Amino acid sequence: CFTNVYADSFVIRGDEVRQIAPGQTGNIADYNYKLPDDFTGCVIAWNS
């Protein structure tokens, strides 16, 4: 069971899907969606 839960939702280029993970870097991770270094959760992605 989970304390409280936030689902974050957004769209990105498929190459940039590697940048969402905690500790990664690049043109979206540095500038508009950073996960914390010690994150817990799941990241889920599909082409649309």
Partner 1 sequence: GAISSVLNDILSRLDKVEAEVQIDRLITGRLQSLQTYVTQQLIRAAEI
Q: Which residues bind partner 1 (CB under 8 A)?
A: 22-23, 25, 37
- Least Å distance, CB 30 to partner 1, is 13
In the complex, the smallest distance separating the C-beta of residue 39 from partner 1, rounded to whole angstroms, is 11
Contacts 24+ apart (CB under 8 A), 4-13: 8/33, 11/48
Residue 14 or 23 with smaller CB distance to partner 1:
23
What whole-number distance in Å separates Cα of residue 31 and Cα of residue 2?
29
Q: Is the Cβ of residue 15 or residue 38 nearer to partner 1 in the bound state?
A: 38
